[PDB]
Symmetry: C2
Subunit: 57 residues, 2 copies
């Protein structure tokens, strides 16, 4: 049962407190963002350019 | 109102021995003051453990997350 069935593409690095990469292989979406200001959790588009940057170097 | 030497980084100590099967999710934090830090939510005890990012299985895990 994949918690992420929907993804949001309109998310910027600046909006996020942290990312949670769910250990759920088989699920297409496993990236959940805990958002700043409101503490809502939303699954994000894994294609967001900033993700690879955040998952840092 | 000052805010200094009171708001610690999520991680100061790390663990390099963690089995992927005992990981529910990886909490990735990345801030200017603390850099990249990974906190694993463990399956066996639901506790949070800071892990070494240089771990081998981490890269593939993150990679397979389509990002």
């Amino acid at each position: 049962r994949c918690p992420c069935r929907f993804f949001e593409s309109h998310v910027a690095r600046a909006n996020v407190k942290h990312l949670k990469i769910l250990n759920t292989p088989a699920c297409a979406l496993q990236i959940v963002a805990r958002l700043k200001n409101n503490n809502r959790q939303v699954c994000i588009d894994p294609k967001l350019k900033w993700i690879q940057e955040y998952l840092e170097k």
